[PDB]
């Protein structure tokens with residue numbers, strides 16, 4: 123409810139961190155959602171097995187690097203377009219702090235030796251327990267480290283009024 | 295989900311709502327993450343295009359029916375296993391309130407007439423704008439209404455010490 127942002131995916135750079143939305147709780151705590159954009163929109167997508175395995179690993183490793191000093195992660199979830207994840211948290215860490223934690227978590231993916239070190243990979247604890255690939259998760263993580271992580275600007279990427287009009291007044 | 299309840303997927307009923315996590319905030323507010331389980335674990339899955347199209351519709355429709363009266367949705371995002379969505383929100387609505395909102399939102403999906411009506415479905419606003427199917431999204435929605443929405447219990451579904459040892 124403070125700011126959410128309509129940004130232009132045709133100009134979006136990746137890998138990148140961007141503040142997607144800021145909200146406040148009734149007693150005034152800040153909640154921030156970050157766009158952790160792994161793939162360039164409409165050019166690249168993550169594979170379904172590797173995104174799922176990465177999901178099992180990512181929020182744990184992000185918590186290890188990012189929690190504390192005014193930040194408590196709520197959830198990290200995949201985007202339905204398979205180009206990134208949204209991470210919701212209590213606090214207002216800056217984008218570079220988030221990027222650095224993200225890269226450290228990617229590096230942590232690469233030291234996963236085998237599937238027995240993937241948390242919850244079994245029929246009791248995973249909804250689709252065959253839909254997994256450590257090697258694809260590690261390919262994703264390696265890609266992020268090879269490409270580095272940029273900080274994207276909501277001002278730069280903002281869709282102007284006119285364009286949002288053109289798009290929204292085709293939705294009816 | 296980070297810091298989740300360790301529940302037994304092999305016994306989880308679906309469609310169902312479940313409290314997946316609760317958190318406090320520094321000045322004392324509450325956050326709740328709900329497991330919106332569409333598919334029976336390891337028996338059914340949603341198709342990738344339909345889940346994506348549903349993601350585009352669901353947030354909006356859910357806010358229509360659920361926001362207000364001590365609740366503000368943060369995010370509704372798909373699960374990587376494609377069996378459900380996690381909904382994070384500020385507040386502590388009961389499970390049945392959430393189930394009622396969810397069904398109303400599914401009914402809303404069914405009145406979408408064409409793909410052009412779907413918010414943000416275009417190259418400017420979607421990361422994978424070809425990966426969409428309104429018909430799959432409506433099939434999903436219809437299945438929820440046909441099956442109804444149960445409330446699942448973390449106490450009922452808790453994995454026992456002996457099983458967690460086995461794991």
Ligand SMILES: C[C@@]1(O)OC[C@H](O)C1(O)O
Pocket residue numbers: 169170173174200201202203204342345346372373374375376
């Ligand atoms: C939405 C989703 O769960 O389905 C396809 C993608 O794999 C996903 O985002 O992880």
Ligand code: MET
Pocket residue numbers: 177178181197198199200242295296371372373374380
């Ligand atoms: C191991 S369950 C993890 C939930 C996941 N981080 C999501 O929010 O979709």
Ligand SMILES: [Zn+2]
Pocket residue numbers: 174178247248249250251374375
């Ligand atoms: Zn899983």
Ligand SMILES: [Zn+2]
Pocket residue numbers: 202203346350419420421422423
């Ligand atoms: Zn999309």
